[PDB]
Design a protein around this ligand. Structure first.
Ligand SMILES: OC[C@H]1O[C@@](CO)(O[C@H]2O[C@H](CO)[C@@H](O)[C@H](O)[C@H]2O)[C@@H](O)[C@@H]1O
Ligand SMILES: *[C@@H]1O[C@H](CO)[C@@H](O)[C@H](O)[C@H]1NC(C)=O
Ligand SMILES: *[C@@H]1O[C@H](CO)[C@@H](O)[C@H](O)[C@H]1NC(C)=O
Ligand SMILES: *[C@@H]1O[C@H](CO)[C@@H](O)[C@H](O)[C@H]1NC(C)=O
Ligand SMILES: *[C@@H]1O[C@H](CO)[C@@H](O)[C@H](O)[C@H]1NC(C)=O
Ligand SMILES: [Mg+2]
Ligand SMILES: [Mg+2]
Ligand SMILES: [Mg+2]
Ligand SMILES: [Mg+2]
Ligand SMILES: [Mg+2]
Ligand SMILES: [Mg+2]
Length: 364
C-alpha cells in the first residue's frame, strides 16, 4: 500500500458523502440494471454507515477492512442491486453462476468491499429495467412482475448494428412449410437470414437463423445473436430473442419489425424478501488508498507536525509532491489561499489551517 504522506492536511470543509442515503433509497434496482454512484471529495464514516444501513455482512478483498477507518481515497465507487433469493451464492467472488455471468461481474483484482444489507420490504419498490438498446429497439419495453420480484438474466446476447430479427416479406411470401413471420427491417439493417429448400414432399420448406432459439441454437455460427458474458463494469448486452416471434405471419413492408414481449428469452426472477426485508448487495471499489480527498472521519486524526528544513513527501489539500518546508512570517506569504503556486503551476507555499502558520516550499 502507498504510505500516507509525511506531511498531510485534509481540505477542511468538505460535505458529507451521504453514502447511507444512496444505499437506503427505496427504489432498488435489480442486478440486470445495477446502479453505480461515485463518491469523491467528501467525508464519510464507515462506523456510522454500517449502523445506518441494516448491515448483515461486510468484508473486503485485497484490502484490510480495519484500515479504512481514518483513511483517504481518490474515490469510492459503489455498485448496488437487490438480491434475488435464489441467486445469493452467485455473489461469491469468482463465481460462474448467473448473476456474474450475465448481470454484474465482481472485479476481483481491485481493492473492494462487499456489503450485504437490507431495507424494509413494505417501503421497497424494485426497479427492473432492461439495459439493452437493441432489445428495446425491437420491442422490449417493461417487465410485468409482482412487487419485490427481482429480474436477473441467465444468458446475454450481443448483436451488431445491422441486426434485424425479422424475415424479409418477399422471402416469406413464397414459403409453404414453416413460413416465418416477416416485416420490414430498418434502413441500414439486414433481414433475418433465411433459406427455402425442397425436402421430401415439401416444395418450399423455409428455415431461418437461430433455431430453435438463440440459447439452444443448433448452429450458433449462423445465428446473429452472439453469446456474451458480462465484463467488469458492463451490463447484460441483451436477452436473446426468438426470431420466430418477431414480425407477423404474412407481414408486408407496411409493418415495422417488432418482437412480442414473450420473444425475449433467457431471464428469470425471484423475490428479494426474507424476514419481511429486501436483501441488497453493494460493492465498494476503493481507488487510490492514501491519496485524494474522500476521507474517513471515523477517527480524530491527530494532525502531525509540518516538518521543516528537510525534504519531505506531502499531501496538501489533495495536492501531492515533495519539498522542503520553511516557515515564514505571514508577510512573505503572497496570497489569500491555503496554497501558493508559481508561474509554472508548481506549489511554492502553504498555509496550515490547523495553526495558521505559513510556509515556503522549495524543491529537494
Ligand atoms: O532575510 C531574507 C529571509 O527572508 C525570507 C523569508 O524568511 O525570504 C523573504 O525575504 C526576501 C526579501 O529580501 C524575499 O526575496 C523572499 O522571497 C521572501 O520570502 C527567507 O527566504 C530569507 O532567508
Ligand atoms: C414505510 O411504509 C409505511 C406504510 O406505507 C409508512 O407508514 C412508513 O412511514 C414508511 N417508512 C418510511 C421510512 O417512509
Ligand atoms: C401482468 O401479469 C398479470 C399476471 O400476474 C396478468 O394478469 C396481467 O394481464 C398482465 N398485464 C399485462 C399488461 O401484461
Ligand atoms: C453484422 O454481422 C453480419 C454477419 O452475418 C454481417 O453480414 C454484417 O455485415 C455485420 N454488420 C456489421 C456492421 O459489421
Ligand atoms: C463519525 O464518527 C465519529 C466517531 O464516533 C463521530 O465523532 C462523528 O460525529 C461522525 N461523523 C459523522 C458525519 O457521522
Ligand atoms: Mg455525495
Ligand atoms: Mg440477422
Ligand atoms: Mg463456429
Ligand atoms: Mg434460474
Ligand atoms: Mg463497485
Ligand atoms: Mg522566503
Amino acid at each position: 500500500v502507498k504510505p500516507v504522506a509525511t506531511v498531510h492536511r485534509r481540505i477542511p470543509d468538505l460535505p458529507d458523502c451521504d453514502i447511507d442515503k444512496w444505499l437506503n433509497n427505496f427504489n432498488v434496482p435489480s442486478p440486470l440494471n445495477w446502479e453505480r454512484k461515485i463518491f469523491s471529495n467528501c467525508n464519510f464514516n464507515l462506523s456510522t454507515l454500517l449502523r445506518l444501513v441494516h448491515t448483515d455482512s461486510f468484508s473486503c478483498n485485497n484490502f484490510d477492512e480495519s484500515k479504512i477507518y481514518g483513511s483517504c481515497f481518490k474515490s469510492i465507487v459503489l455498485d448496488k442491486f437487490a438480491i434475488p433469493n435464489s441467486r445469493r451464492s452467485d455473489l461469491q467472488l469468482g463465481s460462474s453462476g448467473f448473476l456474474q455471468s450475465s448481470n454484474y461481474k465482481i472485479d476481483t483484482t481491485s481493492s473492494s468491499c462487499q456489503l450485504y444489507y437490507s431495507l424494509p420490504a413494505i417501503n421497497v419498490t424494485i426497479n427492473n429495467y432492461n439495459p439493452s438498446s437493441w432489445n428495446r429497439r425491437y420491442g422490449f419495453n417493461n417487465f410485468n412482475l409482482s412487487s419485490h420480484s427481482v429480474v436477473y438474466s441467465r444468458y446475454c446476447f450481443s448483436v451488431n448494428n445491422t441486426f434485424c430479427p425479422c424475415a424479409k416479406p418477399s422471402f416469406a411470401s413464397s414459403c409453404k412449410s414453416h413460413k416465418p413471420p416477416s416485416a420490414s427491417c430498418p434502413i441500414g439493417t439486414n433481414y433475418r437470414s433465411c433459406e427455402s429448400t425442397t425436402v421430401l414432399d415439401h416444395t418450399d420448406w423455409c428455415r431461418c437463423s437461430c433455431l430453435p432459439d438463440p440459447i439452444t441454437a443448433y448452429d450458433p455460427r449462423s445465428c446473429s445473436q452472439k453469446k456474451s458474458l458480462v465484463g467488469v463494469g458492463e451490463h447484460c448486452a441483451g436477452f436473446g430473442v426468438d426470431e420466430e416471434k418477431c414480425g407477423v405471419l404474412d407481414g408486408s413492408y407496411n409493418v415495422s419489425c417488432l418482437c412480442s414481449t414473450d420473444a425475449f428469452l433467457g431471464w428469470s426472477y425471484d423475490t428479494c424478501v426474507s424476514n419481511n426485508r429486501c436483501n441488497i448487495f453493494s460493492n465498494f471499489i476503493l481507488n487510490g488508498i492514501n491519496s485524494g480527498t474522500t476521507c474517513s472521519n471515523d477517527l480524530l486524526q491527530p494532525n502531525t507536525e509540518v516538518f521543516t528544513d528537510v525534504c519531505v513527501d506531502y499531501d496538501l489539500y489533495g495536492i501531492t509532491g515533495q519539498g522542503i518546508f520553511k516557515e515564514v512570517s505571514a508577510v512573505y506569504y503572497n496570497s489569500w489561499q491555503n496554497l501558493l503556486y508559481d508561474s509554472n503551476g508548481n506549489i511554492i507555499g502553504f498555509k496550515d489551517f490547523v495553526t495558521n502558520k505559513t510556509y515556503n516550499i522549495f524543491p529537494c
